Ligand binder design. Structure first.
Ligand SMILES: Nc1nc2c(ncn2[C@@H]2O[C@H](COP(=O)(O)OP(=O)(O)OP(O)(O)=S)[C@@H](O)[C@H]2O)c(=O)[nH]1
Ligand SMILES: [Mg+2]
Lengths: 122, 325, 766, 170
């Protein structure tokens, strides 16, 4: 950070990860703040740079307590981010994980509909 | 203390740093602690003397601060009086414009000293020599105080002697042929009152007569009678018939500061960087940087700020072999 | 500023009293006064006030009286590193301390050396240069011809500077290694031991700096050659000094090299040394009634390649008649054994060392060191000690009182802790093998009497061999019954004995229910004893002992007993009575701090809630803090009698914070409100808005009070209020950001960066 | 060998720097460069003992100039220099001694007073007697030296070393 914020972003992502880790402590301890902590996580992620290498770490830290299905839309953005970042295979993996079924093995079968947003994203 | 040592070293070039230093500097004099304002006023005087006549755009603020801090305290009084002395030396004619803003302060100083600290008046009087032609339109305000000081019995003898010397020095720079000639009468009583002080009195009388010229010769007889009674003579009575350069970079301590031989731990290396950044300033060839060494020692971020410039100053002096080391 | 002067006047007069206790009390009084009562005023006037303070200091240091100088030195030591590293302090302190060192009395000697160490540790800008002076001076005092007092000065100053601040001292490491060995050979024992201690500290420094060195050092090797020179007979022909002194110096040097090379054998030494110092501290208390571990790789290699040499040298010096060399050998031999025991077994060094040390236990002055060596050697070698097991065990038995306690009753004799620690490490070595032996040895150790070493070794034996664990309790419990109730355990006396009895009763775990018998008794006599220490200890133990009883109510609900419940309840009532009614504040603080959440079920009752409410308005502030914390915790348990009371209280702190103009009361009110907020979220949540308004207007006050405690504690309270109310504050958070940033950017405002940033983070998170 | 620092204090325009160059180089040149802070070194011998002297010429001070703390930590020897051709220098050296002692309480510390510019006999306005009287008022040691009389400068520095040794011995 003595040179430019652009270089310091690498360490600022680590700061973000550690503060979110403290928020994981709070999430485990206090059931009443789980929705609020989830919204804080969403907003802070929206504030971060849209890079898969950092979104992966942040969502992996979040995965300690919150599964993808509990924060569906967040992971959908990750999928979208991986869709347009030369990592389409990871986007497909994320979308099949979120759907729970793989239409890539059921090409004839029509797509799922229980979760229509993720169907649209996939 | 650092800024002064820069302004002293550069000389007139220091004027280029006026617009940066003064607007903060004066402001600090307005908000600094009382114990430090005396030193800041003294350094303001030194800086004004170095700057000479280029202090005009800040002189209104300077005199404002002077007025609203010229309390009747001996220490600040003396420091401020020194500041007026140095301002008079710096400006001279221009300072006329700023003279009327200080006369009431001078008068209150004259009539409100009640201690051996009365010596402060002498220092104020020690400024009045340096005024000269810029006292023309305000001589008659500053005259009656000195008139009192001639024949004041309560005032100490050295104060009266100083007053005589002051009017003596004023004699050769002001036109006393006007009403001011009346000061002949005061000193006469001094001649007939104080015996130990008659010498300066007669020196002053001689100088005044020399300034007056023909206009005094008519009124000789009373002074002649005084002299005959006192039998003290002077020659004039008979005449009534008719930058800082560079500094040596100590090389030994310079490569010694780069002593990374036995520095291992992180604390060791941070201490090495600190000591090196300080020693570069201490051994810096430029007086401007070396003036910052004392402040850098007690404030490391200053040392960090000038590490590059300090190294440049130290490096440009070394020869090929020292540079190679 | 009449008070600011007169306070120092009475401080100076008290410090001039010839009584050591009076001077020391004045020392901590002045420390308190300057520490947490003269921080309301800023740094520049602090420097100005230091002029008067140092005038008063030197008024003590000026006189040639030893006691007046000692009092001045106490004042200086208490005043070094207590406030910020201001300017005027360090020059005056350094110049004052430089005169003391040549002094003769070792008391002022060590005091001044430690003072120099702490002054260098003060962490100001002038420390660096200052260190380079003192070390140089110290080194210059080692090059003197003899210059005894100054040699001891250099030794002690180097030692305390080395441990105090290493970074500045390491730059003088090479001159130190060039010069210290001059003082190591000094013919006086004190200089010798101190010089080896300074060498110890410097060697530790070199050891931290070793692994990251580009290349291996030479200091260890040079030290070994110096020791060899010490042992060389030809080089020992220097006149005017004793050969035995060179022997002692060389042995001490080798001991230190081995220690820095043998941390694994030094850890047990350090633990046993802590136990021995615990025994000494207990003895000192009775009389007054009436670290980091490191191993040097290069030193380890050097001794690996020069182990036989040192062993032969030590075993040759074994036969010395001088006591000091005998003790140094007794300290070194077990260290050597712990270094490379395999060489002890193979090279057959066991015989000579073991015969010598078993001969030393007979010797009077070496007996303590003899048992030291026995205990350390037992764990050093865990196989070849079997041949020697009876030969040591009978010595421990002889040292302890014989079996016939009643017939041959000891008149007055204290068993030194080294015997007990030797027993402990002997159990460590061959624990299961000697289970019966330690079983037989158990009885006379209990017969010795209560000592800290005894309790420690009983705990160790219990942990090492659990099989007979129940015996150690069943005996010691009975011993406790013989000193607390002065009766056998059925299923006046020294203050220190009872104190330690309470310590072990509360600390050492027991399973038998008979502890309950103690509890009531501890709540009947000791809590009511006129000795403040006995009362404090009884309160502590009665607090610790009820956790198993409360566990039945908490964890094992199927086995809740009315007997245990009533015992806990009335003991708790007695504890609260003690913690409320006793005018002494320390007992109150300890009692209230001793009530954890475990007791909330019995503290929810109105009877105890009344006592807690009384504590909640105590004269002393810390007791008030514990009281409000406890009541806030209990609010969830019994809202009826607490929530109204805490609401009235909240009104009181709001009134005091909004009206009181004095800074200290404002700070105390802010702390009280913060504790209430953190401890009773349910109460504050509906009243968050007025509290936040009051705190904001206290932050935005046009008049900044001189002290920083008010603003710091207001910020902390705002932060934890945000922590309580998550989103309710969302619409008062932007103004808080504006205020917090405004105070962060400029440091002129008294608000501290730490708490401001903490409040900002808590606001963001909440 | 014993390493000794010395700090040279006094009013501006008095020949502190001139004395330092005279002692360390034997020369004397009139440039009048206001010395912000200078350090010189020599390895001399006094009473057959080798002292490595490190001389720290401080910038001139006035009665209002604060006393830097740097010259109160590790100095172990002071040379208070005043010009015999300036009463202002005498008054300011009195003030500087006061401020130095204040910076070390009033602890005994090796200090010696030097009447500089002795060769300027015509311009002298301080005589020997009052300079001495001040010195034993401070319990210090008096000397007079000039930048053209190298023997006197060597005497000054030898004398401060001797005074430091004596104070150390006590
Ligand atoms: N005639 C004569 N001149 C001297 C003598 N000592 C010093 N001076 C002159 O006085 C001038 C100032 O002396 P200097 O040594 O530079 O003062 P300083 O105190 O070091 O300089 P500053 O940084 O403190 S302002 C020099 O130009 C020097 O030549 C002396 O004994 N005789
Ligand atoms: Mg100079």
């Amino acid at each position: 950070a003595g040179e430019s914020y652009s270089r310091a972003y690498g360490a600022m992502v680590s700061c973000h990860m550690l503060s979110e880790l403290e928020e994981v402590i709070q999430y485990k301890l206090v059931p009443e703040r789980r929705e609020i902590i989830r919204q804080i996580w969403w907003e802070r992620l929206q504030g971060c740079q849209r890079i898969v290498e950092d979104w992966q770490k942040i969502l992996m830290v979040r995965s300690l307590v919150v599964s993808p299905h509990e924060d569906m839309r967040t992971w959908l953005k990750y999928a979208s981010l991986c869709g347009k970042s030369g990592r389409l295979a990871l986007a497909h993996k994320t979308l099949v994980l979120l759907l729970g079924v793989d239409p890539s093995r059921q090409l004839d079968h029509p797509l799922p509909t229980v979760h229509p947003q993720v169907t649209y994203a996939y | 203390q650092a800024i002064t040592f820069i302004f002293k070293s550069l000389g007139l070039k220091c004027v280029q740093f006026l617009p940066q230093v003064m607007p903060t500097f004066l402001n600090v004099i307005r908000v600094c602690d009382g114990a430090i304002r005396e030193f800041l006023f003294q350094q303001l005087g030194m800086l004004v003397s170095f700057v000479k006549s280029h202090i005009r755009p800040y002189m209104d603020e300077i005199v404002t601060l002077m007025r609203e801090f010229w309390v009747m305290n001996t220490s600040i009084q003396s420091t401020i009086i020194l500041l007026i002395e140095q301002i008079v030396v710096a400006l001279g004619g221009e300072f006329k414009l700023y003279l009327p803003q200080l006369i009431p302060h001078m008068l209150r100083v004259f009539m409100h000293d009640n201690s051996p600290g009365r010596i402060v008046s002498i220092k104020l009087l020690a400024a009045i020599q340096l005024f000269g032609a810029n006292l023309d339109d305000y001589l008659h305000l500053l005259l009656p105080p000195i008139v009192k000081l001639f024949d004041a019995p309560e005032a100490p003898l050295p104060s009266r002697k100083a007053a005589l010397e002051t009017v003596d020095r004023l004699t050769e720079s002001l036109d006393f042929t006007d009403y001011a000639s009346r000061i002949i009468h005061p000193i006469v009583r001094t001649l007939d009152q104080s015996p130990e002080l008659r010498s300066t009195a007669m020196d002053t009388l001689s100088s005044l007569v020399f300034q007056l010229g023909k206009k005094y010769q008519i009124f000789i007889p009373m002074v002649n009678k005084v002299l005959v009674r006192h039998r003290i003579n002077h020659q004039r009575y008979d005449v009534l018939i008719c930058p800082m350069k560079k500094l040596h970079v100590s090389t030994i301590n310079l490569q010694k500061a780069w002593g990374a031989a036995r520095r291992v731990s992180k604390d060791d290396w941070l201490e090495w960087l600190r000591r090196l950044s300080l020693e570069l300033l201490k051994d810096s060839s430029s007086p401007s940087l070396r003036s910052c060494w004392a402040l850098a020692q007690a404030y490391n971020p200053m040392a960090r700020d000038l590490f590059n410039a300090a190294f440049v100053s130290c490096w440009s002096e070394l020869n090929e072999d020292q540079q190679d080391e | 500023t009449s008070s600011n002067v007169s306070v120092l006047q009475q401080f100076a007069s008290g410090l001039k009293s010839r009584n050591e206790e009076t001077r020391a009390k004045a020392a901590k009084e002045l420390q308190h006064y300057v520490t947490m009562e003269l921080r309301e005023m800023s740094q520049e006037e602090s420097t100005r006030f230091y002029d008067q303070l140092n005038h008063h200091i030197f008024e003590l240091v000026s006189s040639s009286d030893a006691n007046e100088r000692k009092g001045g030195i106490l004042a200086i030591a208490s005043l070094i590193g207590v406030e910020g590293g201001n300017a005027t302090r360090i020059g005056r302190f350094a110049n004052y301390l430089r005169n003391l060192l040549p002094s003769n009395d070792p008391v002022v000697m060590e005091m001044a050396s430690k003072a120099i160490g702490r002054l260098a540790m003060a962490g100001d800008t002038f420390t660096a240069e200052y260190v380079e002076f003192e070390v140089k001076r110290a080194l210059e005092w080692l090059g003197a011809d003899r210059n005894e007092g100054r040699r001891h000065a250099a030794v002690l100053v180097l030692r305390e500077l080395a441990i105090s601040v290493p970074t500045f001292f390491f730059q003088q490491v090479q001159p130190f290694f060039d010069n210290i060995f001059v003082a190591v050979w000094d013919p006086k024992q004190a200089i010798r031991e101190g010089a080896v201690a300074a060498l110890r500290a410097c060697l530790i420094l070199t050891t931290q700096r070793e692994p990251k060195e580009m290349q291996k050092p030479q200091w260890y090797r040079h030290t070994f050659e110096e020791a060899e020179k010490g042992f060389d007979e030809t080089l020992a022909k220097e006149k005017g000094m004793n050969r035995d002194d060179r022997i002692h110096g060389a042995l001490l040097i080798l001991n230190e090299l081995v220690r820095i090379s043998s941390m694994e054998g030094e850890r047990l030494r350090e633990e046993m040394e802590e136990i021995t110092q615990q025994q000494l501290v207990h003895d000192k208390y009775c009389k007054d009634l009436m670290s980091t571990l490191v191993e040097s790789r290069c030193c380890r290699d050097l001794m690996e390649e020069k182990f036989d040499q040192v062993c032969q040298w030590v075993l040759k010096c074994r036969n010395s008649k001088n006591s000091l060399i005998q003790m140094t050998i007794l300290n070194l031999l077990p260290r050597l054994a712990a270094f490379r025991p395999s060489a002890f077994t193979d090279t057959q060094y066991l015989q000579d060392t073991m015969n010598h040390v078993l001969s030393c236990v007979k010797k009077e002055k070496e007996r303590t060191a003899a048992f030291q060596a026995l205990g350390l050697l037992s764990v050093a070698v865990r196989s070849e000690f079997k041949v020697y097991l009876p030969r040591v065990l009978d010595i421990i038995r002889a040292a302890l009182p014989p079996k016939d306690f009643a017939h041959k009753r000891q008149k007055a004799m204290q068993v030194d802790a080294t015997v007990f620690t030797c027993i402990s490490m002997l159990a460590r070595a061959m624990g299961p093998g000697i289970q019966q032996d330690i079983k037989e040895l158990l009885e006379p150790m209990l017969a010795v009497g209560l000592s800290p070493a005894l309790t420690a070794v009983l705990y160790d034996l219990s942990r090492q061999i659990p099989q007979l664990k129940k015996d150690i309790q069943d005996g010691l419990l009975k011993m406790l019954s013989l000193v607390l109730m002065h009766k056998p355990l059925r299923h006046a006396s020294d203050v220190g004995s009872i104190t330690l009895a309470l310590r072990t009763l509360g600390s050492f775990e027991f399973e038998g229910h008979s502890l309950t018998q103690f509890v009531r008794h501890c709540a009947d006599h000791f809590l009511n004893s006129e000795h403040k220490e006995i009362r404090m200890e009884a309160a502590r133990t009665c607090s610790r002992l009820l956790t198993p009883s409360i566990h039945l109510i908490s964890g094992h609900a199927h086995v809740v007993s009315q007997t245990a419940v009533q015992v806990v309840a009335d003991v708790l009532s007695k504890l609260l009575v003690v913690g409320i009614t006793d005018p002494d504040p320390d007992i109150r603080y300890c009692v209230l701090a001793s009530l954890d959440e475990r007791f909330d079920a019995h503290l929810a009752q109105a009877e105890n809630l009344q006592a807690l409410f009384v504590a909640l308005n105590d004269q002393v502030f810390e007791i008030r803090e514990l009281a409000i914390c406890t009541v806030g915790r209990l609010s969830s348990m019994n809202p009826a009698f607490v929530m109204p009371f805490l609401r009235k209280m909240l009104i009181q702190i709001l009134t005091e914070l909004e009206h009181s103009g004095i800074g200290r009361i404002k700070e105390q009110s802010a702390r009280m409100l913060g504790h209430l907020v953190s401890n009773a979220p349910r109460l504050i949540r509906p009243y968050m808005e007025p509290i936040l308004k009051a705190l904001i207007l206290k932050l935005k006050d046009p008049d900044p009070d001189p002290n920083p405690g008010v603003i710091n504690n207001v910020l902390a309270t705002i932060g934890e209020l945000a922590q309580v109310s998550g989103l309710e504050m969302r619409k008062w958070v932007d103004e808080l950001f504006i205020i917090i940033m405004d105070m962060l950017q400029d440091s002129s405002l008294l608000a501290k960066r730490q708490v401001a940033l903490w409040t900002l983070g808590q606001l963001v998170a909440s | 060998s014993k390493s000794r620092k010395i700090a040279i204090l006094g009013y501006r325009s008095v020949g502190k720097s001139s004395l330092t160059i005279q002692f360390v180089e034997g020369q004397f040149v009139d440039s009048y460069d206001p010395t912000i802070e200078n350090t010189f070194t020599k390895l001399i011998t006094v009473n057959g003992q080798e002292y490595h002297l490190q001389l720290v010429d401080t910038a001139g001070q006035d009665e209002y100039s604060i006393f830097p703390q740097t010259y109160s930590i590790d100095i172990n020897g002071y040379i208070l220099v005043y010009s015999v051709t300036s009463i202002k220098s005498f008054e300011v050296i009195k003030v500087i001694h006061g401020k130095l002692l204040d910076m070390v309480g009033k602890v005994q510390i090796p200090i010696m007073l030097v009447g500089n510019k002795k060769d300027l006999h015509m311009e002298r306005v301080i005589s020997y007697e009052e300079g001495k009287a001040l010195a034993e008022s401070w319990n210090a040691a008096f000397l007079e030296s000039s930048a053209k009389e190298n023997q006197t400068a060597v005497d000054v520095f030898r004398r401060i070393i001797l005074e430091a040794e004596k104070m150390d011995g006590a």
